[PDB]
Amino acid sequence: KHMVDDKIHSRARGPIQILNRQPMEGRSRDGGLRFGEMERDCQIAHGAAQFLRERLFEASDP
Amino acid sequence: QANQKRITTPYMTKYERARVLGTRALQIAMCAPVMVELEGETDPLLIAMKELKARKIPIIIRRYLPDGSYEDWGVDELIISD
Amino acid sequence: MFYHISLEHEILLHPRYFGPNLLNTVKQKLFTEVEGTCTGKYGFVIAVTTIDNIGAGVIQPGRGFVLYPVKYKAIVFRPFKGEVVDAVVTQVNKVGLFTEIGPMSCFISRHSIPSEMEFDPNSNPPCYKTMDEDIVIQQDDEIRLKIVGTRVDKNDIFAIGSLMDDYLGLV
Amino acid sequence: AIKTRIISDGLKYSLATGNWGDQKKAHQARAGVSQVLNRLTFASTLSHLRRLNSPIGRDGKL
Amino acid sequence: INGSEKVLIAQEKMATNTVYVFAKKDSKYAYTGECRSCLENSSRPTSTIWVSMLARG
Amino acid sequence: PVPPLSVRPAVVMQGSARNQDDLTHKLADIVKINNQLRRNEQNGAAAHVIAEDVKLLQFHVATMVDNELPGLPRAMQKSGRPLKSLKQRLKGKEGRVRGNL
RNA sequence: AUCGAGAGGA
DNA sequence: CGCTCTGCTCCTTCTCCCATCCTCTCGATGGCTATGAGATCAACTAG
DNA sequence: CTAGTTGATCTCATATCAGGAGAAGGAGCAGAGCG
């Protein structure tokens, strides 16, 4: 059942949630992908502070 | 802090290189004058790397020390490795 | 009151202005910014006298701008409660009398003025005159006043003055 | 006196949601009973109809 | 139910009316014999009765 | 302190029925019992009645900021689901700090 | 739309 | 010689935590919380 | 200017089981000084 066309998804400034003005959840909601705690830790290890700020501040909910 | 004696490394860190290149590329993209000559480069990142190789980026890195003081290094004063 | 004070400001600068001449651009931008400006706390700034120091310009991360903190000597004008100043009369009216103190224009109501100085709209120049008609306060006259109240509107100060106190009259 | 909605709506709700118990006790009730039949392939349907469940709790790591 | 095909999953449970002697390592009792008792035609939940031995000391 | 509408948005459903947040329902209970206690202290009420009202107000405020109090009954709502208090909004995973910051 | 639950993927 | 002040142990609460990201379906959710008389007032709609 | 009508706004009034692990309090108590 797992065809790629039912899984491919992309986002660039779509809809946002009401409570926290962050991207929605899911392909069906045209949502954004979660940049989670482990991604934050990985980018902290990388030392990429501006990319980390872009992902956790500017690309989510400025 | 005595600029005659700066205790930090004379090398540019990988993070300093990254942020200096990004900053200067944004400055070039916002129509700042270029310090080096240009053959056909139109990408700000390429121009910034050419300026760094030429040692002609007009930026000062203010490295903070844990005690609270700081040391100002010109991008031309640091040793660029990569 | 004329004064000479050192003041602090910080101004952003676009990357286009880096150029071979940079300090001059920050200087002239400061001038074009705070020349003729007005603030209620430091009063009105007549002009900027001399630029003392130009701090290190810090590049804001994520933004091409650079903020320069500038220290500059500028001369201000601040009216005060209880201060006496000579003013120039500009308009006479039945609602009150309008006199200009430098950039500010202050209005004095007939209630604050002593009752001796009558209205006189029938005179060819609108003027204030007493029973004896000795003192004459009309347009363009030079008269002393005491500044009682200050009010700031749209960052612009407008004062109010009184002529009741003794020795406050025509120059 | 007989309000038939008790038995009808109770059985219908319990089979519809899977929360096995009274509708008011929606948290004391144990879910996962009465799942939607899998109709993706005949083997999935047969296996779902022959499915057993050990309600030990997935959280348990024993 | 409401046009939706619902399948009841068989649910496992410990058998009733049988005595099961276990021994919990971390407990005040050395051995515990439990019996989840339930009348033939169910009318109440399973009434569990335990008969335990207190741990030595 | 009753938070603003952003913290407890009233989301509109497919139709016109505006559904209120759990915080708003809880604040409704708090205001109800607060007004009830205010009138019962102002007008005729027994001491034990006022005591019961104060106990219920305490329960409502506590379950507004923290619903999982041991022993006490969980603040309920329609459909038999407990309300999500301010503590569960940011308690752990999928809360504000870990789930949104 | 929300919430919950369930079924799944790596 | 009877009281105090420990401070050790056993039990008891009590409270916190339990991988990451992702897809889909399915059921419930309702929440509804009036009414009108009087006075006030400010704007037209006429005079 | 003068009434008069018409909305809006607001006040008022009517009713009766296969967790775990650690941290904190409390209690029982053995014992040491010591009044």
Side-chain angles (χ1 to χ4, degrees):
Chain A
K1 67 189 290 187
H2 310 291
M3 301 162 200
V4 62
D5 267 12
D6 296 89
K7 287 161 160 51
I8 182 160
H9 174 52
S10 169
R11 194 200 156 87
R13 293 266 286 175
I16 60 189
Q17 307 180 41
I18 301 300
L19 186 56
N20 51 73
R21 276 86 159 284
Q22 292 178 12
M24 302 289 325
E25 187 188 299
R27 314 175 60 254
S28 48
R29 270 82 69 84
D30 274 359
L33 282 294
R34 177 165 166 86
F35 190 93
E37 274 171 304
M38 290 177 101
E39 283 75 349
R40 178 194 64 85
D41 311 313
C42 172
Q43 297 302 316
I44 287 159
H46 274 295
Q50 286 102 52
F51 180 65
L52 187 56
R53 185 176 183 276
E54 186 209 16
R55 287 292 114 181
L56 292 178
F57 176 45
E58 301 164 358
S60 192
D61 54 4
Chain B
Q1 209 162 355
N3 184 90
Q4 273 61 235
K5 182 175 73 175
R6 287 179 297 191
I7 56 151
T8 54
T9 181
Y11 291 83
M12 183 176 284
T13 74
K14 67 176 96 157
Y15 309 110
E16 288 168 350
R17 173 165 37 74
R19 189 169 157 194
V20 167
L21 283 186
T23 294
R24 185 59 180 160
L26 185 74
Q27 288 172 2
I28 288 149
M30 284 159 82
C31 295
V34 176
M35 308 292 131
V36 299
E37 308 67 17
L38 295 169
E39 287 73 356
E41 293 82 3
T42 71
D43 180 14
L45 282 171
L46 303 181
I47 300 158
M49 293 183 286
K50 265 197 61 60
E51 283 183 353
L52 189 64
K53 293 187 285 184
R55 308 271 285 223
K56 303 295 286 178
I57 288 185
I59 290 170
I60 305 299
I61 296 150
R62 171 164 286 178
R63 308 172 155 177
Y64 291 97
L65 279 292
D67 63 358
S69 71
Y70 54 78
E71 298 189 353
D72 289 358
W73 292 73
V75 166
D76 55 313
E77 293 178 346
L78 291 161
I79 301 160
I80 302 299
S81 50
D82 189 78
Chain C
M1 292 280 276
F2 292 164
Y3 272 98
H4 191 161
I5 293 154
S6 49
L7 194 49
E8 198 277 325
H9 187 39
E10 57 189 30
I11 193 66
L12 302 156
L13 189 81
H14 199 260
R16 69 170 75 88
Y17 298 122
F18 290 174
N21 65 77
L22 178 58
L23 279 295
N24 296 115
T25 300
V26 185
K27 268 166 208 173
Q28 69 94 29
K29 280 181 184 292
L30 182 57
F31 285 130
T32 60
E33 185 176 3
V34 306
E35 181 262 317
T37 184
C38 194
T39 76
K41 63 190 79 142
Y42 311 121
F44 182 76
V45 192
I46 300 300
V48 183
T49 302
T50 299
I51 180 151
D52 174 72
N53 183 15
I54 182 64
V58 192
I59 298 158
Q60 307 323 99
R63 299 153 86 263
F65 302 132
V66 183
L67 64 81
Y68 277 89
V70 300
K71 292 181 181 179
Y72 60 91
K73 313 296 222 195
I75 60 181
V76 305
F77 192 107
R78 199 175 212 266
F80 291 118
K81 179 198 317 195
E83 179 191 340
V84 173
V85 182
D86 215 320
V88 187
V89 185
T90 59
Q91 317 181 67
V92 174
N93 198 268
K94 196 150 69 171
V95 67
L97 196 145
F98 302 156
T99 79
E100 278 178 348
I101 302 174
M104 283 73 74
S105 179
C106 52
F107 69 100
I108 311 96
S109 315
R110 178 81 208 270
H111 309 75
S112 87
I113 303 188
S115 198
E116 200 75 352
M117 284 72 74
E118 319 178 5
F119 291 127
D120 275 326
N122 306 269
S123 279
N124 277 326
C127 169
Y128 283 11
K129 258 183 194 156
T130 58
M131 295 299 103
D132 190 286
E133 301 145 313
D134 210 336
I135 189 169
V136 288
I137 307 95
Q138 73 208 80
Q139 189 273 333
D140 202 40
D141 275 28
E142 44 268 27
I143 178 159
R144 316 198 166 158
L145 283 76
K146 185 185 285 292
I147 304 92
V148 306
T150 45
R151 194 73 201 151
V152 69
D153 182 280
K154 194 153 49 156
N155 304 324
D156 297 331
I157 307 190
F158 291 132
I160 317 185
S162 49
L163 194 57
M164 62 78 70
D165 210 32
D166 52 0
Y167 291 107
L168 281 294
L170 209 60
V171 180
Chain D
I2 286 157
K3 53 177 71 66
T4 58
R5 294 328 292 192
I6 320 294
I7 289 164
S8 294
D9 292 358
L11 292 175
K12 202 190 293 190
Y13 160 81
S14 199
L15 297 169
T17 52
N19 300 322
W20 207 249
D22 208 36
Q23 182 166 3
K24 195 202 194 184
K25 303 178 75 173
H27 52 98
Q28 299 194 27
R30 54 189 172 86
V33 194
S34 193
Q35 302 175 3
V36 184
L37 185 69
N38 209 352
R39 283 283 193 180
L40 190 149
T41 193
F42 195 64
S44 62
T45 305
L46 288 173
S47 72
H48 206 168
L49 292 153
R50 304 178 98 250
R51 196 73 58 70
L52 317 175
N53 203 311
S54 191
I56 304 299
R58 312 303 186 268
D59 59 285
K61 305 310 204 306
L62 185 58
Chain E
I1 296 90
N2 304 333
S4 195
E5 292 175 324
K6 301 279 157 60
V7 54
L8 287 173
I9 312 306
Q11 305 291 318
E12 277 174 19
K13 68 193 183 69
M14 278 307 263
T16 53
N17 312 343
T18 311
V19 187
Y20 295 140
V21 184
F22 301 125
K24 189 163 178 289
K25 65 213 183 299
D26 52 328
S27 68
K28 66 184 288 184
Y29 311 104
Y31 296 87
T32 182
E34 73 185 5
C35 175
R36 292 180 179 90
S37 184
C38 166
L39 193 58
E40 193 70 12
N41 303 321
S42 173
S43 314
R44 313 152 296 284
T46 47
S47 56
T48 318
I49 175 166
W50 294 269
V51 181
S52 310
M53 273 183 74
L54 269 288
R56 185 171 291 284
Chain F
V2 64
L5 311 177
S6 308
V7 183
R8 45 189 185 84
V11 69
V12 69
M13 293 177 71
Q14 72 291 340
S16 62
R18 206 82 82 78
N19 197 334
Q20 305 293 348
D21 204 82
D22 294 3
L23 291 184
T24 308
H25 293 167
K26 197 75 196 169
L27 291 151
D29 278 305
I30 288 160
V31 174
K32 278 172 73 174
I33 301 299
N34 191 50
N35 288 334
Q36 188 274 331
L37 182 63
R38 193 183 296 284
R39 60 162 155 282
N40 285 30
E41 66 176 39
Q42 192 57 225
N43 289 337
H48 77 279
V49 169
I50 297 169
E52 190 65 16
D53 298 312
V54 167
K55 187 269 183 181
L56 187 63
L57 182 61
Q58 172 73 74
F59 169 78
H60 284 308
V61 174
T63 43
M64 183 179 72
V65 309
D66 178 14
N67 207 322
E68 272 68 3
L69 266 292
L72 318 183
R74 278 85 172 76
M76 295 299 291
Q77 195 39 250
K78 304 302 104 180
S79 84
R81 61 181 189 79
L83 294 154
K84 158 158 276 195
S85 49
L86 294 155
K87 162 152 178 162
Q88 292 84 14
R89 279 194 167 200
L90 58 85
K91 205 212 300 197
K93 198 203 310 194
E94 293 180 353
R96 292 284 161 288
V97 190
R98 292 180 63 183
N100 295 126
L101 285 158

Short mmCIF file of all heavy atoms in Angstrom, two decimals, chain B residues 19 23-24 26-27 30-33 59 62, chain C residues 14-16 18-19 56 59 61-64:
data_model
loop_
_atom_site.label_atom_id
_atom_site.label_comp_id
_atom_site.label_asym_id
_atom_site.label_seq_id
_atom_site.Cartn_x
_atom_site.Cartn_y
_atom_site.Cartn_z
N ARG B 19 30.33 32.16 9.94
CA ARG B 19 29.51 33.34 10.18
C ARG B 19 30.04 34.55 9.42
O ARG B 19 29.25 35.36 8.93
CB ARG B 19 29.42 33.65 11.66
CG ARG B 19 28.40 34.73 11.97
CD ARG B 19 28.15 34.85 13.45
NE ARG B 19 27.63 36.16 13.83
CZ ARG B 19 27.57 36.62 15.07
NH1 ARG B 19 28.00 35.88 16.09
NH2 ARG B 19 27.08 37.82 15.31
N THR B 23 27.75 36.49 6.78
CA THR B 23 27.51 37.91 6.98
C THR B 23 27.96 38.72 5.78
O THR B 23 27.23 39.59 5.30
CB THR B 23 28.25 38.36 8.25
OG1 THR B 23 27.67 37.72 9.39
CG2 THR B 23 28.18 39.86 8.42
N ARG B 24 29.17 38.46 5.29
CA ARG B 24 29.68 39.24 4.17
C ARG B 24 28.89 38.94 2.90
O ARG B 24 28.69 39.83 2.07
CB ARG B 24 31.16 38.95 3.97
CG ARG B 24 31.84 39.80 2.89
CD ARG B 24 31.74 41.29 3.18
NE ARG B 24 32.40 42.09 2.16
CZ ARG B 24 32.17 43.38 1.93
NH1 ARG B 24 31.28 44.05 2.66
NH2 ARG B 24 32.82 44.01 0.97
N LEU B 26 25.68 38.23 2.83
CA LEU B 26 24.46 39.03 2.96
C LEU B 26 24.74 40.49 2.66
O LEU B 26 23.93 41.16 2.01
CB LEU B 26 23.87 38.87 4.36
CG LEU B 26 22.52 39.55 4.59
CD1 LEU B 26 21.40 38.80 3.89
CD2 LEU B 26 22.24 39.67 6.08
N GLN B 27 25.87 41.01 3.14
CA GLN B 27 26.22 42.40 2.87
C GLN B 27 26.38 42.65 1.37
O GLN B 27 25.91 43.67 0.85
CB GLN B 27 27.50 42.77 3.61
CG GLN B 27 27.31 42.90 5.10
CD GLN B 27 28.62 43.07 5.84
OE1 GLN B 27 29.68 43.12 5.23
NE2 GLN B 27 28.55 43.16 7.15
N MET B 30 23.10 42.74 -0.28
CA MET B 30 22.45 44.02 -0.02
C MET B 30 23.25 45.19 -0.58
O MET B 30 23.21 46.30 -0.03
CB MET B 30 22.20 44.17 1.47
CG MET B 30 21.02 43.32 1.93
SD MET B 30 20.99 42.94 3.68
CE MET B 30 20.28 44.44 4.35
N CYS B 31 24.01 44.96 -1.66
CA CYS B 31 24.62 46.01 -2.47
C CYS B 31 25.74 46.72 -1.71
O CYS B 31 25.93 47.93 -1.86
CB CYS B 31 23.58 47.01 -2.96
SG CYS B 31 22.38 46.31 -4.12
N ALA B 32 26.49 45.98 -0.91
CA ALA B 32 27.68 46.55 -0.31
C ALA B 32 28.82 46.52 -1.32
O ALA B 32 28.85 45.66 -2.21
CB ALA B 32 28.08 45.77 0.93
N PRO B 33 29.77 47.45 -1.24
CA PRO B 33 30.91 47.40 -2.16
C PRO B 33 31.72 46.14 -1.96
O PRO B 33 31.88 45.64 -0.84
CB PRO B 33 31.73 48.65 -1.80
CG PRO B 33 30.86 49.48 -0.99
CD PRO B 33 29.86 48.61 -0.33
N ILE B 59 35.45 43.09 8.27
CA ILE B 59 34.72 42.67 9.46
C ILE B 59 35.73 42.44 10.58
O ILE B 59 36.86 42.01 10.34
CB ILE B 59 33.88 41.39 9.19
CG1 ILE B 59 32.71 41.73 8.26
CG2 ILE B 59 33.36 40.78 10.50
CD1 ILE B 59 31.95 40.53 7.73
N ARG B 62 34.71 40.00 17.35
CA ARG B 62 34.82 40.32 18.77
C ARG B 62 34.63 39.02 19.54
O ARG B 62 33.50 38.59 19.78
CB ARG B 62 33.79 41.37 19.16
CG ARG B 62 33.67 41.60 20.65
CD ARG B 62 32.95 42.90 20.92
NE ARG B 62 33.79 44.05 20.63
CZ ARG B 62 33.40 45.32 20.73
NH1 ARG B 62 32.18 45.62 21.14
NH2 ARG B 62 34.26 46.29 20.44
N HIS C 14 22.52 50.69 6.36
CA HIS C 14 22.41 49.68 5.33
C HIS C 14 23.79 49.31 4.77
O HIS C 14 24.71 50.13 4.81
CB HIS C 14 21.51 50.18 4.20
CG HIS C 14 20.97 49.11 3.32
ND1 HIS C 14 21.51 48.80 2.09
CD2 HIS C 14 19.91 48.27 3.48
CE1 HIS C 14 20.83 47.82 1.54
NE2 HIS C 14 19.85 47.47 2.36
N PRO C 15 23.96 48.09 4.26
CA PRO C 15 25.25 47.75 3.64
C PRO C 15 25.65 48.60 2.45
O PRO C 15 26.84 48.64 2.12
CB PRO C 15 25.06 46.28 3.24
CG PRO C 15 24.11 45.76 4.22
CD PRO C 15 23.16 46.88 4.51
N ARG C 16 24.70 49.26 1.78
CA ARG C 16 25.06 50.08 0.63
C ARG C 16 25.99 51.23 1.02
O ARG C 16 26.83 51.64 0.22
CB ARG C 16 23.80 50.61 -0.06
CG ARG C 16 23.00 51.66 0.71
CD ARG C 16 21.92 52.30 -0.15
NE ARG C 16 20.78 51.42 -0.38
CZ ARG C 16 19.71 51.33 0.42
NH1 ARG C 16 19.62 52.05 1.53
NH2 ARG C 16 18.73 50.49 0.11
N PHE C 18 28.39 51.36 3.24
CA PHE C 18 29.71 51.05 3.78
C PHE C 18 30.79 51.84 3.05
O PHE C 18 31.45 52.70 3.64
CB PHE C 18 29.97 49.54 3.69
CG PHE C 18 29.12 48.70 4.64
CD1 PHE C 18 29.16 47.32 4.56
CD2 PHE C 18 28.30 49.28 5.61
CE1 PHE C 18 28.41 46.54 5.42
CE2 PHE C 18 27.55 48.50 6.46
CZ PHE C 18 27.61 47.13 6.37
N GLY C 19 30.97 51.57 1.76
CA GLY C 19 31.68 52.46 0.86
C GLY C 19 33.08 52.84 1.28
O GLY C 19 33.61 52.34 2.28
N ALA C 56 31.85 51.24 18.16
CA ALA C 56 32.05 50.14 17.23
C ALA C 56 30.73 49.73 16.60
O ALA C 56 29.73 49.54 17.30
CB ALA C 56 32.68 48.95 17.95
N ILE C 59 27.50 44.36 13.60
CA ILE C 59 26.65 43.75 12.59
C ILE C 59 25.60 42.90 13.28
O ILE C 59 25.92 41.95 14.00
CB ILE C 59 27.49 42.92 11.61
CG1 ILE C 59 28.49 43.80 10.86
CG2 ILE C 59 26.58 42.24 10.60
CD1 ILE C 59 29.66 43.03 10.30
N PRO C 61 23.23 39.92 13.54
CA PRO C 61 23.12 38.65 12.82
C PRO C 61 21.73 38.49 12.22
O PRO C 61 20.72 38.84 12.83
CB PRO C 61 23.41 37.59 13.88
CG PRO C 61 23.18 38.26 15.17
CD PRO C 61 23.46 39.71 14.98
N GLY C 62 21.68 37.94 11.01
CA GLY C 62 20.45 37.79 10.27
C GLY C 62 19.99 39.03 9.53
O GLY C 62 19.04 38.94 8.75
N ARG C 63 20.64 40.17 9.75
CA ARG C 63 20.28 41.43 9.13
C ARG C 63 21.55 42.09 8.62
O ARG C 63 22.57 42.09 9.31
CB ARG C 63 19.56 42.35 10.14
CG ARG C 63 18.26 41.78 10.69
CD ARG C 63 17.91 42.31 12.08
NE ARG C 63 17.16 43.57 12.05
CZ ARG C 63 17.70 44.78 12.19
NH1 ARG C 63 19.00 44.96 12.36
NH2 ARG C 63 16.91 45.85 12.14
N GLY C 64 21.49 42.65 7.41
CA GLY C 64 22.68 43.29 6.89
C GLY C 64 23.05 44.57 7.59
O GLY C 64 24.18 45.05 7.41
#
